[PDB]
Amino acid sequence: KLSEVRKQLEEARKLSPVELEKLVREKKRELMELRFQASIGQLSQNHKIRDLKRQIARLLTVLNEKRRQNA
Amino acid sequence: RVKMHVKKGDTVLVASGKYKGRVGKVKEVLPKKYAVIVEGVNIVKKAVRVSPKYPQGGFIEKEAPLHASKVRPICPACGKPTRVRKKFLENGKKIRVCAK
Amino acid sequence: TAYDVILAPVLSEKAYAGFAEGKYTFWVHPKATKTEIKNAVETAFKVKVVKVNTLHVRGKKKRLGRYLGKRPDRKKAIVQVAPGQKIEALEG
RNA sequence: CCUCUAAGCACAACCUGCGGGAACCCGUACCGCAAACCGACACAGGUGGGCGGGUGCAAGAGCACUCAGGCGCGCGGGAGA
RNA sequence: CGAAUGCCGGCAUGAGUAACGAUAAAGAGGGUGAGAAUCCCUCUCGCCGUAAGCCCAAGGGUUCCUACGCAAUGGUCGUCAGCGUAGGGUUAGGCGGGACCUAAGGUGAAGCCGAAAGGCGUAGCCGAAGGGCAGCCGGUUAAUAUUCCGGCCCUUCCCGCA
RNA sequence: GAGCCGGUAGCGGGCGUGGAUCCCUGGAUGUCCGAAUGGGGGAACCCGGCCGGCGGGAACGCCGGUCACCGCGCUUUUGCGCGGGGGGAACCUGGGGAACUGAAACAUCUCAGUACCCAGAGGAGAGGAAAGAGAAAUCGACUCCCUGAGUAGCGGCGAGCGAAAGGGGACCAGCCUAAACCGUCCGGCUUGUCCGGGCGGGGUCGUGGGGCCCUCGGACACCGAAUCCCCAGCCUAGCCGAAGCUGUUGGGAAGCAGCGCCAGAGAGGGUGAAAGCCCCGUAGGCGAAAGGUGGGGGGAUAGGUGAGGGUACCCGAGUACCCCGUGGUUCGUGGAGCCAUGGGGGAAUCUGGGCGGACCACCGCCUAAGGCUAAGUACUCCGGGUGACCGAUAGCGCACCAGUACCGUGAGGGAAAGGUGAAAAGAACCCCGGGAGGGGAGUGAAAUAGAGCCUGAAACCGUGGGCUUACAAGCAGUCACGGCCCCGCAAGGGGUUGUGGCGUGCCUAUUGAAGCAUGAGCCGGCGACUCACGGUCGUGGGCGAGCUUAAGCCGUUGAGGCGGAGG
Ligand SMILES: [Mg+2]
Ligand SMILES: [Mg+2]
Ligand SMILES: [Mg+2]
Ligand SMILES: [Mg+2]
Ligand SMILES: [Mg+2]
Ligand SMILES: [Mg+2]
Ligand SMILES: [Mg+2]
Ligand SMILES: [Mg+2]
Ligand SMILES: [Mg+2]
Ligand SMILES: [Mg+2]
Ligand SMILES: [Mg+2]
Ligand SMILES: [Mg+2]
Ligand SMILES: [Mg+2]
Ligand SMILES: [Mg+2]
Ligand SMILES: [Mg+2]
Ligand SMILES: [Mg+2]
Ligand SMILES: [Mg+2]
Ligand SMILES: [Mg+2]
Ligand SMILES: [Mg+2]
Ligand SMILES: [Mg+2]
Ligand SMILES: [Mg+2]
Ligand SMILES: [Mg+2]
Ligand SMILES: [Mg+2]
Ligand SMILES: [Mg+2]
Ligand SMILES: [Mg+2]
Ligand SMILES: [Mg+2]
Ligand SMILES: [Mg+2]
Ligand SMILES: [Mg+2]
Ligand SMILES: [Mg+2]
Ligand SMILES: [Mg+2]
Ligand SMILES: [Mg+2]
Ligand SMILES: [Mg+2]
Ligand SMILES: [Mg+2]
Ligand SMILES: [Mg+2]
Ligand SMILES: [Mg+2]
Ligand SMILES: [Mg+2]
Ligand SMILES: [Mg+2]
Ligand SMILES: [Mg+2]
Ligand SMILES: [Mg+2]
Ligand SMILES: [Mg+2]
Ligand SMILES: [Mg+2]
Ligand SMILES: [Mg+2]
Ligand SMILES: [Mg+2]
Ligand SMILES: [Mg+2]
Ligand SMILES: [Mg+2]
Ligand SMILES: [Mg+2]
Ligand SMILES: [Mg+2]
Ligand SMILES: [Mg+2]
Ligand SMILES: [Mg+2]
Ligand SMILES: [Mg+2]
Ligand SMILES: [Mg+2]
Ligand SMILES: [Mg+2]
Ligand SMILES: [Mg+2]
Ligand SMILES: [Mg+2]
Ligand SMILES: [Mg+2]
Ligand SMILES: [Mg+2]
Ligand SMILES: [Mg+2]
Ligand SMILES: [Mg+2]
Ligand SMILES: [Mg+2]
Ligand SMILES: [Mg+2]
Ligand SMILES: [Mg+2]
Ligand SMILES: [Mg+2]
Ligand SMILES: [Mg+2]
Ligand SMILES: [Mg+2]
Ligand SMILES: [Mg+2]
Ligand SMILES: [Mg+2]
Ligand SMILES: [Mg+2]
Ligand SMILES: [Mg+2]
Ligand SMILES: [Mg+2]
Ligand SMILES: [Mg+2]
Ligand SMILES: [Mg+2]
Ligand SMILES: [Mg+2]
Ligand SMILES: [Mg+2]
Ligand SMILES: [Mg+2]
Ligand SMILES: [Mg+2]
Ligand SMILES: [Mg+2]
Ligand SMILES: [Mg+2]
Ligand SMILES: [Mg+2]
Ligand SMILES: [Mg+2]
Ligand SMILES: [Mg+2]
Ligand SMILES: [Mg+2]
Ligand SMILES: [Mg+2]
Ligand SMILES: [Mg+2]
Ligand SMILES: [Mg+2]
Ligand SMILES: [Mg+2]
Ligand SMILES: [Mg+2]
Ligand SMILES: [Mg+2]
Ligand SMILES: [Mg+2]
Ligand SMILES: [Mg+2]
Ligand SMILES: [Mg+2]
Ligand SMILES: [Mg+2]
Ligand SMILES: [Mg+2]
Ligand SMILES: [Mg+2]
Ligand SMILES: [Mg+2]
Ligand SMILES: [Mg+2]
Ligand SMILES: [Mg+2]
Ligand SMILES: [Mg+2]
Ligand SMILES: [Mg+2]
Ligand SMILES: [Mg+2]
Ligand SMILES: [Mg+2]
Ligand SMILES: [Mg+2]
Ligand SMILES: [Mg+2]
Ligand SMILES: [Mg+2]
Ligand SMILES: [Mg+2]
Ligand SMILES: [Mg+2]
Ligand SMILES: [Mg+2]
Ligand SMILES: [Mg+2]
Ligand SMILES: [Mg+2]
Ligand SMILES: [Mg+2]
Ligand SMILES: [Mg+2]
Ligand SMILES: [Mg+2]
Ligand SMILES: [Mg+2]
């Protein structure tokens, strides 16, 4: 995951506000999708959940830095 | 962090007690217990079966931990302590004589 | 944030009983509004919501050893969907 | 709530129809003259309001019996000083 | 340390003693169970019935329902429970509060006073079991119901049209 | 630099030498409450305005901005900027300010300007450059320590209270203004060449200083910050580190043995027991991209650099000063000065005015009514290092999930409770039982280390055995014989007690207690003549017409020296 993690910061850093907010919306739904399965059992690869929870944290963290001057 | 000691998943010599002499490998270092695994101090553990699953239970079982001190690393020679070399761009543990 | 309002389905004899009619019940944000929930449900499961009932669920007090505590308080929202409409995800 | 008029505004506005929409937050279990409330206790004490049937007795929420409901009181068995 | 009606703790004596909490009251046959006068059912019997019945407010805070249970808590017993573990359960435009009103009182623009802290105080504001305000009858759950469902009947907003 | 996903085991999933977890630094995110600040409110909950965005969205809802009050300054206002508000263990300053006590009663006095309440400040605070001290042809800010000194003095001269000077040390620092006088802007008005407000210049002193005149004037000539800048160093993670093998006893070596080795390291801790060389370390030596701190060292600034003679212009006002009421000081009405000041009266500008303990004259000392100022000093919530400090009734109330459980309406009170083993190897399975619990088996060196488990005393409750008791009567024992039982070959000894003799518990308090006077159910643990500074004897030493230092300084880091103020 470490590797596939050092990407976002880049593949996500170069997009802008309107590109992220929508990307994050997408992720947030996926997270719902998950926590929605466990409640019934299905999904069990926890690693997935926490893994997605932290992704959003990054997108937001990156979007927060962009909204401070730029253009 | 600081919690560090002398061995890692490599080959060591037991200087301990019941297995003084015995030699083994990857001790799956803890180090919350500051112990290692090796291939000795392996006791017989009773078993009912933590859940029918995998029914029957025997007495030959697993290998117990061993205080990290009871063991000594070895490479291209025998027992002996460990020193640390800079590798001109690194930090690798080398033995007084050999090298790892 | 629309997927932050609906935490999960409830799953229970009583809850399922609702499915016959457009009655799906969910565990939602303790602070969420009936109106907030209506929207959340509409965009999440693509449906037309026409009624929303909610009730608070106080956490059961529990004790593991001499250590006494409580479970987190919750909000339950049972959303009623427009005539003949099903929230696919909650069927099965 | 009805009414009066000031600023204003009278291509606003209010008022009556008729259509189409909108209508949030908290409480809601359970005990509640009590073993769940106040009295260290499953304490013969204390606890505000409403319903509280029938027959008889002069009357009544009194008294005796009983509807509906609820209970025989959370140690017993004997003995006949 | 032997003493301070010493201090903390432990264990004795009284003692198998007084007690087991209203004198409304019990009996039997089935059942369950390792075991129950004590749990379940049936049939008798007694008590309350301006109740010892039902409902609301306060206070209490899951004690509600259910499945496994019985070490302890139950003044005995326990298979039972207001007890242990776990899972369920409380659904509102119209019921009660809040997006209304003011009461004593409280707070407090102006303003007054006091070594400091702080004490007053007009307007205003807060303050309810008072004023205002549109839902009645049924049916459903193991557990909610003027809240869910059914029938019938209403209330405010917003927009359009006349 | 190899393991990680806290206390985490567990199902069930993942990440890491292409370098995670982890540690340090800086940022991001930071629901609600709380000074709490949009309004409200029963803290963590309700309800809004305005601007922008979500949804069919106008009703409804959510999201992001933003809206408290007060004080300064800009300035009418509209508004705008800075700030303020709370918290903080002690420490500090200021505003208020007890009593029990002591005086062997008690009121002045004491306790004490203490405890406490309030406001404020900060890493310190206060104080601070002489209107001083007080006798010295003297000293020269303030604070802090030692002496001075239990002195001088105060005191119902009772209890008791208690200075300063000087000397020896720590530390070091000195400045800015007000006003003469000159300029400027603004607003008054009588536009008066004046009134007063703000600016700027000028000016800061006591062998008096300054203003304004006139002489002298020859300074890229020296001073130089308490301000700013940059460095070193320091703080917030870390890193490198010498030297042992074998045998033997044993569950286990590190013990013991043989023969070695390192040492700028033989501090310490751990590893199955006791180890310089197995592990962590220790001596010695390295280390910061980032954030702090930082004249210690450099600089750069602001700021400061004169004599003569004239004038007599100015040197802080409801003040000085006097009286009345008080406080402060060693000073309690005293011969009562000095410093503050609530009241009344009320000046002068160095030909002035205060002080040297009433007052007066001499001789002197000093310049009030404006402000600022490092260091030396105080404290310890926090981090570290040490201990002739404690070791679970001790030590903090808490070694443990404690300011908790419980208590109280509330302020508030406030517990108990630590240890298996080297390693969970935590007892499969079988047998009795519903379970609990046991008996086997098995683990271990040990299971009477089997789990609230190291050791496990005493009181207390039992089972088995030995002696001995139902005609005896007692502070329960003791002396003497005797019987039975038990040891050893014996002499002798141990246990029990049948008769005989003799016998008034312990403590306390009292003239006097078995006392029918007090206290104690029994056992275990806690539980009371100390310490500091003075004094007086005595005593072991040193030196003795003398003895001895205190603070502090230099040294060490369990090393001591110096220091003559002073007694
Ligand atoms: Mg590196
Ligand atoms: Mg509701
Ligand atoms: Mg609302
Ligand atoms: Mg109900
Ligand atoms: Mg009653
Ligand atoms: Mg009643
Ligand atoms: Mg009872
Ligand atoms: Mg009662
Ligand atoms: Mg009554
Ligand atoms: Mg009648
Ligand atoms: Mg009658
Ligand atoms: Mg009946
Ligand atoms: Mg009872
Ligand atoms: Mg005692
Ligand atoms: Mg004694
Ligand atoms: Mg005692
Ligand atoms: Mg006791
Ligand atoms: Mg007894
Ligand atoms: Mg008896
Ligand atoms: Mg008796
Ligand atoms: Mg009797
Ligand atoms: Mg009896
Ligand atoms: Mg009874
Ligand atoms: Mg009875
Ligand atoms: Mg009767
Ligand atoms: Mg009757
Ligand atoms: Mg009656
Ligand atoms: Mg209630
Ligand atoms: Mg419970
Ligand atoms: Mg029940
Ligand atoms: Mg049952
Ligand atoms: Mg019982
Ligand atoms: Mg229960
Ligand atoms: Mg209101
Ligand atoms: Mg007031
Ligand atoms: Mg008022
Ligand atoms: Mg009002
Ligand atoms: Mg009301
Ligand atoms: Mg009403
Ligand atoms: Mg019910
Ligand atoms: Mg209906
Ligand atoms: Mg854990
Ligand atoms: Mg984990
Ligand atoms: Mg950080
Ligand atoms: Mg607020
Ligand atoms: Mg407020
Ligand atoms: Mg808007
Ligand atoms: Mg401040
Ligand atoms: Mg003070
Ligand atoms: Mg004071
Ligand atoms: Mg004070
Ligand atoms: Mg007194
Ligand atoms: Mg006295
Ligand atoms: Mg005094
Ligand atoms: Mg300092
Ligand atoms: Mg200072
Ligand atoms: Mg300092
Ligand atoms: Mg001066
Ligand atoms: Mg001096
Ligand atoms: Mg000037
Ligand atoms: Mg000047
Ligand atoms: Mg090293
Ligand atoms: Mg080493
Ligand atoms: Mg041994
Ligand atoms: Mg050896
Ligand atoms: Mg020896
Ligand atoms: Mg060692
Ligand atoms: Mg050692
Ligand atoms: Mg050796
Ligand atoms: Mg070092
Ligand atoms: Mg730096
Ligand atoms: Mg003059
Ligand atoms: Mg005085
Ligand atoms: Mg005086
Ligand atoms: Mg005066
Ligand atoms: Mg005066
Ligand atoms: Mg004077
Ligand atoms: Mg005078
Ligand atoms: Mg004088
Ligand atoms: Mg003088
Ligand atoms: Mg004199
Ligand atoms: Mg003088
Ligand atoms: Mg001055
Ligand atoms: Mg001055
Ligand atoms: Mg000052
Ligand atoms: Mg100062
Ligand atoms: Mg200190
Ligand atoms: Mg303790
Ligand atoms: Mg102990
Ligand atoms: Mg502590
Ligand atoms: Mg304690
Ligand atoms: Mg209470
Ligand atoms: Mg064995
Ligand atoms: Mg042991
Ligand atoms: Mg031990
Ligand atoms: Mg033991
Ligand atoms: Mg014993
Ligand atoms: Mg016996
Ligand atoms: Mg006889
Ligand atoms: Mg006899
Ligand atoms: Mg005798
Ligand atoms: Mg006496
Ligand atoms: Mg005597
Ligand atoms: Mg007696
Ligand atoms: Mg006695
Ligand atoms: Mg007496
Ligand atoms: Mg006594
Ligand atoms: Mg007694
Ligand atoms: Mg004792
Ligand atoms: Mg004792
Ligand atoms: Mg002495
Ligand atoms: Mg002496």
UniProtKB/Swiss-Prot annotation, chain A:
Key words, A-Z: Ribonucleoprotein, Ribosomal protein
Example of a GO MF term: structural constituent of ribosome
Signal peptide boundaries: none
Claim: Ribonucleoprotein is one of the keywords in the record: yes
Source domain of life: Bacteria
Keyword presence, Ribosomal protein: yes
Gene Ontology CC: cytosolic large ribosomal subunit
One GO BP annotation of this record: translation
Cross-referenced PANTHER family: 60S RIBOSOMAL PROTEIN L35/50S RIBOSOMAL PROTEIN L29, LARGE RIBOSOMAL SUBUNIT PROTEIN UL29C
Role this protein plays: One of the proteins that surrounds the polypeptide exit tunnel on the outside of the subunit.
Subunit: Part of the 50S ribosomal subunit.
Similarity comment text for this entry: Belongs to the universal ribosomal protein uL29 family.
Protein name: Large ribosomal subunit protein uL29
Organism: Thermus thermophilus (strain ATCC 27634 / DSM 579 / HB8)
From Swiss-Prot, chain B:
Transmembrane segments annotated in the record for this chain: none
Classification via Pfam families: KOW, ribosomal_L24
A cellular component annotation (GO) from this entry: ribonucleoprotein complex
UniProtKB keywords: Ribonucleoprotein, Ribosomal protein, RNA-binding, rRNA-binding
Protein name per UniProt: Large ribosomal subunit protein uL24
Encoding gene, per UniProt annotation: rplX
Organism: Thermus thermophilus (strain ATCC 27634 / DSM 579 / HB8)
GO molecular function term, any single one: rRNA binding
PROSITE patterns linked to this entry: RIBOSOMAL_L24 (PS01108)
InterPro entries recorded: KOW, Rib_uL2_dom2, Ribosomal_uL24, Ribosomal_uL24_CS, Ribosomal_uL24_KOW, Translation_prot_SH3-like_sf
Curated annotation (Swiss-Prot), chain C:
GO cellular component, one term: ribosome
GO biological process, one term: translation
Keyword Ribonucleoprotein: yes
Alphabetized UniProt keyword annotations: Ribonucleoprotein, Ribosomal protein, RNA-binding, rRNA-binding
MF terms (GO), sorted A to Z: rRNA binding; structural constituent of ribosome
Entry superkingdom: Bacteria
A Pfam family recorded for this sequence: Ribosomal_L23
Subunit structure: Contacts protein L29, and trigger factor when it is bound to the ribosome. Part of the 50S ribosomal subunit.
Described purpose of this protein according to its UniProt entry: One of the early assembly proteins it binds 23S rRNA. One of the proteins that surrounds the polypeptide exit tunnel on the outside of the ribosome. Forms the main docking site for trigger factor binding to the ribosome.
Similarity field: Belongs to the universal ribosomal protein uL23 family.
Name this polypeptide is given: Large ribosomal subunit protein uL23
